[PDB]
Design a binder for this molecule. Structure first.
Ligand SMILES: Cc1cc(=O)n(C)c2cc(N3C(=O)CC[C@H](NS(=O)(=O)CC(C)C)[C@H]3c3ccc(Cl)cc3)ccc12
Ligand SMILES: Cc1cc(=O)n(C)c2cc(N3C(=O)CC[C@H](NS(=O)(=O)CC(C)C)[C@H]3c3ccc(Cl)cc3)ccc12
Lengths: 113, 113
């Protein structure tokens, strides 16, 4: 492993701690969510993101954040706002934006300087 | 845990992997290393470094790197060059210097955007 990979694993672990049921742990299938494939063409989940970190496919935090936002956006797109899935996705979306904001990334940069 | 703590735990883990017998895992006593405290006025070891990470006593990678360097220097000052201790400290020093170089850290900071 590498430093960028460890920081992204950290951010991932912190986000996944907010999903203790594991709603977003693994890909949604049509078996569990009828019509999911019809509505969601760009699927994402925390397991996939973990595999992508391990293969070093994220070249920046911006790239990692985009997949994270995509996962949350898919949950809010397929599910209606009165479901546990939508509500949690909105919450964790906010937490991730705060955790990985410019201001936060700047303080971390200081500690590498 | 914080992002800096996680980064430092990564560097520490990678360096300890190079010391499977734990030569540097805990403080050297004078019973095991006669006269050590006469030669070495600022002891350091991987166990202490871990405790400092946990206690949040590193302001930067520079500070951590300085403890690692101190650990290696102590080994290379006290022990004779034909010893396992000297030779392993030198090997580990070089590996650490490669892993925590300014160049590596600039690259890592670029990826935090
Ligand atoms: C209908 C539906 C939509 C949706 O967007 N998500 C994220 C769901 C997640 C569901 N899951 C749960 O409600 C409980 C956790 C479960 N994840 S898990 O099986 O990997 C077990 C966890 C402890 C690791 C998740 C889920 C996700 C995919 C599938 Cl195929 C089944 C259930 C079920 C339905 C949906
Ligand atoms: C003589 C000597 C000098 C020195 O600089 N070092 C680092 C030493 C390390 C020594 N140790 C070993 O040779 C084997 C490992 C041992 N570390 S450990 O007790 O923590 C075993 C581990 C698997 C948990 C190490 C050592 C370090 C501290 C002490 Cl007090 C005794 C032995 C022994 C002698 C010296």
């Amino acid at each position: 492993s590498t430093p960028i990979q460890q920081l992204l694993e950290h951010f991932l672990r912190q986000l996944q701690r907010k999903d203790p049921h594991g709603f977003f742990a693994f890909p949604v299938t049509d078996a569990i969510a009828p019509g999911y494939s019809m509505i969601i063409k760009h699927p994402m989940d925390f397991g996939t993101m973990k595999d992508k970190i391990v293969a070093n496919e994220y070249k920046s935090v911006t790239e990692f954040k985009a997949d994270f936002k995509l996962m949350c956006d898919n949950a809010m797109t397929y599910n209606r706002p009165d479901t546990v899935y939508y509500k949690l996705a909105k919450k964790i979306l906010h937490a991730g934006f705060k955790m990985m904001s410019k201001e936060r990334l700047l303080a971390l940069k200081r500690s590498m300087s």
